[PDB]
Amino acid sequence: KDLASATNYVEGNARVTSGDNFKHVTGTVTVILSQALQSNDHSLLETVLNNRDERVIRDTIFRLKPALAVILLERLAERIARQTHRQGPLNVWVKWCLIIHGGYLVSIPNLMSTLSSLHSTLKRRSDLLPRLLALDARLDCTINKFKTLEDDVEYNEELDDAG
Amino acid sequence: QVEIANILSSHLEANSTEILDDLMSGSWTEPEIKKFILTKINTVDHLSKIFLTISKSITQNPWNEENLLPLWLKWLLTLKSGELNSIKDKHTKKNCKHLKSALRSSEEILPVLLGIQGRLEMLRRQAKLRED
Amino acid sequence: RLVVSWSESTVKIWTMGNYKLVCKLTLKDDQNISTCSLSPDGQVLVVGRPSTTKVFHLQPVGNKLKVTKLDNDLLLRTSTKLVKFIDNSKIVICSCEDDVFIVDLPQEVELLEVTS
Amino acid sequence: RMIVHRCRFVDFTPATITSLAFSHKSNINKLTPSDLRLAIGRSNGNIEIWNPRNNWFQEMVIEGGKDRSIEGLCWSNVNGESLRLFSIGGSTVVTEWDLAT
Amino acid sequence: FWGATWISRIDFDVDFPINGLTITDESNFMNHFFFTDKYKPLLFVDLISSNELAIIERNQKAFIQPKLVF
């Protein structure tokens, strides 16, 4: 390399991270839900998470054993983190857990360390909101404005001569 | 409707102070507001007067419960943005900045508030579950 | 209210009250059309080419024009740079050899000599 | 006040210019000859003769034919003879034109 | 009166107030008021009626030479 030349920037194999990274600081499927959480069976639980019926969500978590609820909250954060497009459905699960077992969650020595993933995860969605509203308003005005805003006659000489 | 539209048209020509009251008339409906701005606001001066009046009121009380004036502002800008910025009055620009300042604060208000709206929701729902 | 355009041996006629292409005419000859003249009434359309001159009668049927080719040998063997209508019947044709004559649908017209 | 019917349903498209040729050799010292003309070659067989005097006014058009084009143009200007125009139509043929007719 | 890109009208009962890329033309060639240029190009211009005017107007890939924009 020419000594006059300046060394270029290369990230290489460096590990990226964020400041929120607080790791080192009938019809119910409850029994399956309790089953998979205890045994960490991703396949079994994913089937349980596939239910989109709100009444099922409430009833299942209603009977879930309160200690198992905490680990469920942790796991939903991870599954949200990997796939953000599933944010909508999974907040419902986090919601119904929080209200029903809220009394239990109060009587816990520490929450932030064990629920850090949720807080970081939930925080990210909030940081989007101010910008999206700006996008919506600009996206609002434009649509708002724009919503308001031979053979039959042919004469062929050759065919006429022919007939 | 037609009478109020004519009255507002007359007051705009007459430079009457009653313009706010005409805009505050409850008879106004959203389709009518579109028709008035599109059809009757043909002069830059009338557009400036309405914008100055409405902006001043909202700036004074951005949290007024009545949605009529905000409706007037939102439709005024969407349909006459090109004519509005064409206005070269310094006072009109100054009134804009004041309206921005009050509304800018309101945006800062919202994110904490939305949490509080949620934070009460479970307290109500949790209370309902206890009742059951 | 007819607008007539001719390009590359194809004549298209439009009527405007809003416009409707009432008829279009396709001609055999490879030669492009030099000029087209329409009678004041519009019933008679003359299509002119250097090789030949052809006249076609236009008749309106059901918001459309029916075309019939009136047969006149003299025009067919006549070269035409320019052609115009005196009236609905009589025309003036200037042949490629500068011969001006009148045809009733030839009455030659005397022309002053030009000094070389 | 009169009604204007602005009509664009009529489409006339010219042919691509294919060749260009002047009828005289350039002579800076001498004055422009009265007979100078410019020949325009078209892809649809048309030869257009234009006059560079009085801005540019177009004098006479030679009409082309179906499936006929122009690929080359040359002028012959021999003293005492009429200007002669020769064209190539993309075939094994050289065509000399009667400028009179 | 009209050309390829202009249309004009003149009244012959009123007299007017007295108040580069072509040959210089040193040699001989041989040997009430309305003007508009709005309509162009013009194929043909003529009246339909006393108050109706006909104006007929004209309505291939290209080698890409980008125009730098910043």
Partner: peptide, 29 residues
């Protein structure tokens, strides 16, 4: 009620930040 007031305010704020073939026309002479 304060939610919709604030949300309404937001939309207003961001808002403030932001040939025919045949034509019939009458000439003037």
């Amino acid at each position: 009620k304060q939610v919709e007031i604030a949300e309404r305010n937001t939309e207003l704020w961001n808002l403030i930040d932001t040939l025919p073939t045949y034509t019939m026309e009458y000439l003037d002479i």
